Each structure stands twice: as C-alpha cells, then as structure tokens.
Enzyme design. Structure first.
Site, mmCIF file in Angstrom:
data_model
loop_
_atom_site.group_PDB
_atom_site.id
_atom_site.type_symbol
_atom_site.label_atom_id
_atom_site.label_comp_id
_atom_site.label_asym_id
_atom_site.label_seq_id
_atom_site.Cartn_x
_atom_site.Cartn_y
_atom_site.Cartn_z
ATOM 1 N N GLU A 1 0.836 -1.211 0.000
ATOM 2 C CA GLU A 1 0.000 0.000 0.000
ATOM 3 C C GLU A 1 0.870 1.261 0.000
ATOM 4 O OE1 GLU A 1 -2.993 0.194 -0.622
ATOM 5 O OE2 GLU A 1 -3.955 -1.741 -0.128
ATOM 6 N N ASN B 1 -7.693 8.642 -5.778
ATOM 7 C CA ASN B 1 -8.522 7.658 -6.513
ATOM 8 C C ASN B 1 -9.239 8.343 -7.679
ATOM 9 O OD1 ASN B 1 -9.033 6.425 -3.231
ATOM 10 N ND2 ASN B 1 -7.616 5.598 -4.751
ATOM 11 N N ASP C 1 -12.292 8.329 -8.329
ATOM 12 C CA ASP C 1 -13.610 8.829 -7.862
ATOM 13 C C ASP C 1 -13.451 10.162 -7.123
ATOM 14 O OD1 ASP C 1 -12.716 8.065 -5.284
ATOM 15 O OD2 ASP C 1 -14.484 6.830 -4.889
ATOM 16 N N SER D 1 -11.803 10.528 -4.238
ATOM 17 C CA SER D 1 -11.394 10.209 -2.846
ATOM 18 C C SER D 1 -9.855 10.118 -2.876
ATOM 19 C CB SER D 1 -12.045 8.944 -2.300
ATOM 20 O OG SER D 1 -11.640 7.804 -3.036
ATOM 21 N N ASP E 1 -6.474 8.124 -0.636
ATOM 22 C CA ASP E 1 -5.967 7.108 0.322
ATOM 23 C C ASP E 1 -4.769 7.702 1.077
ATOM 24 O OD1 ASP E 1 -7.825 5.335 -0.803
ATOM 25 O OD2 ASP E 1 -6.306 4.191 -1.873
ATOM 26 N N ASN F 1 -9.092 5.180 2.883
ATOM 27 C CA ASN F 1 -9.791 5.957 1.835
ATOM 28 C C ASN F 1 -10.742 6.951 2.507
ATOM 29 O OD1 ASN F 1 -11.180 6.752 -0.425
ATOM 30 N ND2 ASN F 1 -11.358 4.703 -1.320
ATOM 31 N N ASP G 1 -15.501 -4.873 9.039
ATOM 32 C CA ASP G 1 -16.681 -4.322 8.296
ATOM 33 C C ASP G 1 -17.412 -5.432 7.522
ATOM 34 O OD1 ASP G 1 -18.265 -1.792 7.529
ATOM 35 O OD2 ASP G 1 -17.541 -2.308 5.520
#
Ligand code: NA
Length: 129
Positions: free
Chosen positions: A35, A46, A48, A50, A52, A59, A101
C-alpha cells in the site's frame, strides 16, 4: 516516517493488530508494504476523487474526513491527516474498524492481489517480536 519491516511489525504488534480478526502479523506487514512501502506520509488520489492516506492507504470515501470527498463518510471519526503521523495509532485503530466491516482484509485490494494466500510469515521472518 518510513518504517523498517521489523520496526513496523513491532509497532503493529504493540497496537494489537497481530491476529486481529484472525489476520496474522505478516498479513498486515505485507498489506503495508504494497500500500505505502512502509511510508506513513503516502497519499494517492482515486479516480472517484477520494484519497488514500498513510501506511494502510485508508480511503476518505468512508473512513476519514479530508474536506474534499463529496458525499463521503468519516466512520473512523478522524481527519485523514491523522493517518500520516509517524505514530501509527490512528491508522491501526481505523484499520481495526475496516477489517471488522464484513470483507476482512479484502477491503485492501493490494492485500487481495499481492498478499492473500502467499507466505505472509516471510514478512516478519528474523524480527524480534
Ligand atoms: Na470522508
């Protein structure tokens, strides 16, 4: 901060990630390697819009507030900047919520693609833990 491999394994263990939700420490070290290359300051945008943040590339879409991710949540109740600290506490606390989650470490696409099913113990080989 850029952690050493065994230095990060030690910090993650101290913060109770070792076998958290059944994921051995080598899984967490492997995820961090791909990562962030163990850099707490890593950030990546990202498609979209967003972003990280930090050693585990958490995110802004769901987990932290950065003020620039429309329609997003802040489920870890933290500014995303807290995920860039040399102290990994906020990243670890937030990673525990993520991995709880429902999809376990599949939340980290680089874990699924590069760590899952591999010899993850190699990531803590020779470390004094
Ligand atoms: Na957010």
């Amino acid at each position: 901060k850029v952690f050493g491999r065994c230095e990060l394994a030690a910090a993650m263990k101290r913060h109770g990630l070792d076998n958290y939700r059944g994921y051995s420490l080598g899984n967490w070290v492997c995820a961090a390697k791909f990562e962030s290359n163990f850099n707490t300051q890593a950030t990546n945008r990202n498609t979209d819009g967003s972003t990280d943040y930090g050693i585990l590339q958490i995110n802004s879409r769901w987990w932290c507030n950065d003020g620039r991710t429309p329609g997003s949540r802040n489920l870890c109740n933290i500014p995303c900047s807290a995920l860039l600290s040399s102290d990994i506490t906020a990243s670890v606390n937030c990673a525990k919520k993520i991995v709880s989650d429902g999809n376990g470490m599949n939340a980290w696409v680089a874990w699924r693609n590069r760590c899952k099913g591999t010899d993850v113990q190699a990531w803590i080989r020779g470390c004094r833990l």
